[PDB]
A paper describes a structure:
Using alpaca immune libraries against the receptor‐binding domain (RBD) of the SARS‐CoV‐2 Spike protein, we isolated 45 infection‐blocking VHH antibodies. Single‐domain VHH antibodies (also called nanobodies) are derived from camelid heavy‐chain‐only antibodies, whose antigen‐binding sites are composed of just one peptide chain (Hamers‐Casterman et al, 1993). Infection is initiated when the Receptor‐Binding Domain (RBD) of the SARS‐CoV‐2 Spike docks to angiotensin‐converting enzyme 2 (ACE2), a plasma membrane protein of the target cell.
Numbering used by the authors: 1 to 127
Write the structure that this text describes.
């Protein structure tokens, strides 16, 4: 029942900024992760960032730390990825994905695998 839709892709010049949106519908669980991923030309898909619903905790991939920020509008069921200081090598299809957190002992663990994916949005950083 979960569906995710990415939007906001476009063409931007080197050094520019862009904000992506991931709108989710059908989520009923309280404890879940939303991840951003990307696949560049010639490369495998890689993780970009993730956020969890319980407390808003995040993580970012080494290549984007400080330049990209992932955040939420709970009333719109939406997560944003704000990208600043864009580089040519940030060019990719960007995807968002959903996966439940799972509890063991006293802690909720992030998933390795995500269950539902959007169709992606193209981000091109080029002169």
């Amino acid at each position: 029942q979960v569906q995710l839709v990415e939007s906001g892709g476009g063409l931007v010049q080197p050094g520019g900024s862009l904000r992506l949106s991931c709108a989710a519908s059908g989520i009923t669980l309280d404890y879940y992760a939303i991840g951003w991923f990307r696949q560049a030309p010639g490369k495998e898909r890689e993780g970009v960032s993730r956020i969890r619903s319980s407390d808003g905790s995040t993580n970012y991939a080494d290549s984007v730390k400080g330049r990209f920020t992932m955040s939420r509008d709970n009333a719109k069921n939406t997560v944003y990825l704000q990208m600043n200081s864009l580089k040519p090598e940030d060019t990719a299809v960007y995807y968002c994905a959903y996966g439940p957190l799972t509890k063991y002992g006293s802690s909720w663990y992030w998933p390795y695998e995500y269950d539902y994916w959007g169709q992606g949005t193209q981000v091109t950083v080029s002169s």
